[PDB]
Design a protein around this ligand. Sequence first.
Ligand SMILES: O=c1[nH]cnc2c1ncn2[C@@H]1O[C@H](CO)[C@@H](O)[C@H]1O
Ligand SMILES: O=c1[nH]cnc2c1ncn2[C@@H]1O[C@H](CO)[C@@H](O)[C@H]1O
Ligand SMILES: O=c1[nH]cnc2c1ncn2[C@@H]1O[C@H](CO)[C@@H](O)[C@H]1O
Ligand SMILES: O=c1[nH]cnc2c1ncn2[C@@H]1O[C@H](CO)[C@@H](O)[C@H]1O
Ligand SMILES: O=c1[nH]cnc2c1ncn2[C@@H]1O[C@H](CO)[C@@H](O)[C@H]1O
Ligand SMILES: O=c1[nH]cnc2c1ncn2[C@@H]1O[C@H](CO)[C@@H](O)[C@H]1O
Lengths: 226, 226, 226, 226, 226, 226
Amino acid sequence: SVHIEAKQGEIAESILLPGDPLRAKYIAETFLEDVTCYNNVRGMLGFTGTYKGKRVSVQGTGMGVPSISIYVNELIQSYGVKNLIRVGTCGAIQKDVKVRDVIIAMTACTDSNMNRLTFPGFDFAPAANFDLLKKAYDAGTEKGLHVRVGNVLTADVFYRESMDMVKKLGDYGVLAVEMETTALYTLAAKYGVNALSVLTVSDHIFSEERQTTFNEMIEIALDAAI
Amino acid sequence: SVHIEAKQGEIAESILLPGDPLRAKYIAETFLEDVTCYNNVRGMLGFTGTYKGKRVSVQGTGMGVPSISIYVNELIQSYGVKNLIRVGTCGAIQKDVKVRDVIIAMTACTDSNMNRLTFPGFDFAPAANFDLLKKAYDAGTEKGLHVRVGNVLTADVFYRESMDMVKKLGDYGVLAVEMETTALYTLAAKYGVNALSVLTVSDHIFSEERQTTFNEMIEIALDAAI
Amino acid sequence: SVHIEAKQGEIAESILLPGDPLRAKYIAETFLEDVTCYNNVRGMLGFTGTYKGKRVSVQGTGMGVPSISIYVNELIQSYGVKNLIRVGTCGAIQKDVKVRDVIIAMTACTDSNMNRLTFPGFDFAPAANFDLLKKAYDAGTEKGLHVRVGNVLTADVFYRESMDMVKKLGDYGVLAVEMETTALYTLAAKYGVNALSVLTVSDHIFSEERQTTFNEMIEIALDAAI
Amino acid sequence: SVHIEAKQGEIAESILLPGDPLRAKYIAETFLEDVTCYNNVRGMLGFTGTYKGKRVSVQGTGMGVPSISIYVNELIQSYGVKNLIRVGTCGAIQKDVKVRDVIIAMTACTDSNMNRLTFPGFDFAPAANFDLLKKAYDAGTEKGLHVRVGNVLTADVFYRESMDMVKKLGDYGVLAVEMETTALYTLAAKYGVNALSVLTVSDHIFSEERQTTFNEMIEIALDAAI
Amino acid sequence: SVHIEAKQGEIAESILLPGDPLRAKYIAETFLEDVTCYNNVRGMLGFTGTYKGKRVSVQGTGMGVPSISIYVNELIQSYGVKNLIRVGTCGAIQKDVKVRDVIIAMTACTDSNMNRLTFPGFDFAPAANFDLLKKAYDAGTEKGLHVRVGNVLTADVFYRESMDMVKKLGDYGVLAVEMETTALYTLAAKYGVNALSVLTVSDHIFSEERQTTFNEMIEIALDAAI
Amino acid sequence: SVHIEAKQGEIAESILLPGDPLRAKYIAETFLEDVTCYNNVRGMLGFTGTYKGKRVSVQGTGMGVPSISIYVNELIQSYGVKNLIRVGTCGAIQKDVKVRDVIIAMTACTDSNMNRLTFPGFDFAPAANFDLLKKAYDAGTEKGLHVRVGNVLTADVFYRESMDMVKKLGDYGVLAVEMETTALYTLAAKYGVNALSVLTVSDHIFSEERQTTFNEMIEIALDAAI
Ligand SMILES: O=c1[nH]cnc2c1ncn2[C@@H]1O[C@H](CO)[C@@H](O)[C@H]1O
Ligand SMILES: O=c1[nH]cnc2c1ncn2[C@@H]1O[C@H](CO)[C@@H](O)[C@H]1O
Ligand SMILES: O=c1[nH]cnc2c1ncn2[C@@H]1O[C@H](CO)[C@@H](O)[C@H]1O
Ligand SMILES: O=c1[nH]cnc2c1ncn2[C@@H]1O[C@H](CO)[C@@H](O)[C@H]1O
Ligand SMILES: O=c1[nH]cnc2c1ncn2[C@@H]1O[C@H](CO)[C@@H](O)[C@H]1O
Ligand SMILES: O=c1[nH]cnc2c1ncn2[C@@H]1O[C@H](CO)[C@@H](O)[C@H]1O
């Protein structure tokens, strides 16, 4: 495809989607066997390997709705991918959420215009695939993680001049801020495929230090995949 | 409160919220013991009774975001209600969804302006309480119902001149159209209380005949309450 | 129709539209002869009777744009109604307006999205039928009422977190807040029929105690109907 | 003021507001006695004279919301004007409205952003002063004119690439298109003064030849002023 | 055309566009030879004459996007004009910009809705013709003027209740406020013709006294025309 | 900073900003001497070296407004960068623009919400620094390139379901589509620093094969930097 140099069939139907391509490399090296790297266009590493008998891929997305939308469109429409799990980080926007918690996004709020342009006059609420969500939740629960299922903010701006609206969203239960989920969930819905975002809380708004938790999370994402 | 003539303490902390006050009456008479009617202002019947040892209320909301918002604000802020489950009907906007299916709303899209006014520039995705959602899902699964967990449209207009956008939402996985969930979920989040919407599919967009299914659904809503 | 169980011909061409179905009952019992109740679906009472030799109906609408829009669409499109007068209450948003004043709405402002969706990019100003407005104004003047003709706010939210914009609207002459007029006026215009809203001021923003005034108002609404 | 070179006291409290400054000149010469020209800044002629014993002014506004807003702000805030009647032309957007009809605007729709910026999230419906409206209506009725009271469109664009929305507005009863009323009515309301627009229909969307009608209209505007 | 009474061929292909028709008269009398006045409709003077061997016109536009849009549409579509240079005034919204500076607008911000209606969901940035811009810049530089090339605000409201957003725009480098450029640049782009705005700073937001500078500016606009 | 691991002082005040970090590597290796790599966080390579006696940096930005906004905020606010030139690719949206043309963006249109959130109610037109623009234009002209100065679209979506609005923008002179310029220009303006985007046309909407042109373009960007 335009941004992925893989041959047809090289990408598995189940794929993990970290924002950082170096985390894709880490995931492939740490968890997968029989690995090949199918993409290095723009340095946006993608790999396919085997986890517990199943082929599974891992593809960096870059940061932000526009970047992830490119990769997700291509994965679905050019490579036939069916199950897409973002494995990311996020910033807590409530005191109740703690660093190293795992958040599974039911849905996402956004300051992006992407859905307003598609559905003029409407507020589109991008939703997770419930079956994947339940699998990941059950796996995280059995792994002994602190798992929170709820709402997140998909932000276009990392550096915002006023945080008043982010604080207000936190007062309405929005758990954390990240930069991809709206796009993943919307595009998966458009194409009738299955998506989920599983996030580790890295700080509060108001790698090695989270690597054990981060691995445990990758494990539940892989499981909800296989 | 302005629209509810109940004395303090007369409304239970767990409440079912049908749109039709005559369905509130039906639910109270059919399922509850030790019943009293605490409201008849505007004919918007509300009752409190006992179900399997637990006090539980049932309150008509009327139709539309503005109507349900009045009752939900008053229930939460004047009567201390903590768990609110809408028990409603909806119109399917996909062929895969069938009449008499039970839909549990994860989230809701809307053509209402209510959240745009609260969060200028943002798309707020109103989300269910996951713990209530899981309880209801598990109860419906064990009851042997066809339960679908997903996205719905909360519409301000029942009679729309063009259905193009409703069809488009259906193409993005939105299951059905109804007229309350955005408001319930948003206000419950605002006030830190727990909400869910459990809906029976009554037709396709494109009482007695659903009374057995409707009862089974009330049963799972009551259970997810007690 | 979907929400009205009347047979064809049972609803008169002129109809009064209180928000409260119990007020429809009061109006029918107090003012009309040869009365029959043609609807009890959702408890949303509707009656037809005779006032000074003319058949006239009275139909509760419920609260909010979405609720009244359902009934008004059905009345116009399924029952051939031609003259629709809302008889309601409102909350004053200026000191000059006094409790028990009668307001006849020329037009209405709104925080609803209903017209933005119909007329993207435009501000639609929903207007009263002038002939009905003049009749009601003249009747109220001759009855010796305090009648104010002007602008109102049709609100989706009764409970607003900030009243800054409501106060600002009051500074621009908007008289009172209510929850139906935009929809009535817009739909009547769409279908080429005649609408008016006549409101009693029940309080300030910043039944029996208004029953004499309320009756006098019903009287002018009936007159502007016959 | 910035755009009007009049001394304090030179402008009467009642003023007619044609869009064309040459029509201001015509009105002054044709109807007024004891006339002086108080402004020629930007050629935007303004005059004060006497009509039936009363001082009255007439001021060109130019075309469009931004132009009239300049003059109306200055007239109200710098010159203490209290009654402002636009006397203009318009283009019919319905077959029922005929050339040479006089339209008295109750309210106005718009494609301008001026009110969206003032009242974010709301649709502001700019309304006529009812007392002036009634006076003008009664005067036109007694003069034997075809007078229509209703809704108009205040357009920012005279030349629109698609007329679909203008046609749709006509289907919702909007009578004609012009380019000033929203601003006049909104600013008069802001400042607690009295405004009206009285328009002659000059063509259909889909001077001498209207001069008799145009005079008769000026006459009713002057009367509703004195 | 509707607002210009010129015969075909009477308007030159290059035209200067002051907002004030009396400035059009001044420009024609001061700079042009062999002059004729081709328009006095609505007092909106237009002239054609000869400058250094070339026919060139000058046409008042009035104030605001709607007014200039009328004239520019007619000039382009009815009279075949190809090069349009607004010669105007503006109010500085930064301390760095000084009275009597000449601003050449690269682009313009706006509070008008005109482009939102044309391009729903998008922010259209109206741009100058670079070739005209460079010519004018080089001419102003050689004339020894203080020339600033940058961004301006095209405002619908001259009198704004809060200046917070205007100040904020100044903090983002917007140089000055005026009332026409968005429309000129957008319409010229629509029709594939060449536009520029050249403005003299007349004051700060927070004729004779600028007549020497104003002439020098007209001179560079004429030059960028011939 | 959060996304750049450079020490203070390691990044030069003038910086080139390709979207592709592998192009940053190419630029550093091909054009610069005394090179060091100061960043590999997220694989988003950044280098500093020397070009014709001047220190200059080159930093990948990733794709889309949100990604470039992160890097540009950090470069300006944490590293004191003063001159920022994006060196990118774009897709032509007019037949007149040809593959391998160099476009220098005066301004940018967008479907992003980033500026609507910052300037509610306004259309912000993000503008290039004119001095940098002129330098680059003059350098490209002297190099013998086909240089076009004009408007571009900064898109959030690479894959759009309908191209109607993109085609319409092309009809209004917008030259090409890319995914960063609005953010670069807006943030540079916010912070009072100097930005430009210089783009090679890589295809039409409706590496080695452009490497000679691409180098020549890098050369003019470097020059407009030194
Ligand atoms: O506090 C945060 N705000 C925004 N995005 C965050 C935050 N924490 C983690 N991410 C995630 O990391 C990248 C940005 O650094 C984005 O991919 C975003 O999803
Ligand atoms: O097809 C439908 N469209 C809209 N609302 C519906 C539909 N089916 C059921 N409801 C529900 O019933 C009431 C309206 O009749 C509303 O309360 C809505 O939630
Ligand atoms: O102060 C008020 N705010 C909003 N609606 C009001 C107010 N006063 C009367 N109504 C009217 O009564 C119902 C809501 O209680 C709505 O039908 C509304 O039109
Ligand atoms: O058909 C029309 N469209 C728009 N404005 C009109 C029309 N007819 C009359 N006017 C009025 O005349 C000026 C514009 O020529 C404007 O002042 C407008 O109010
Ligand atoms: O400070 C200003 N604000 C708005 N417009 C201005 C300013 N200074 C000059 N103009 C220009 O003069 C007319 C309005 O008086 C408008 O044509 C506008 O472009
Ligand atoms: O046709 C195009 N559409 C959108 N972006 C493009 C196009 N051509 C080049 N780019 C540029 O390359 C990346 C996306 O592939 C983005 O950085 C964008 O600026």
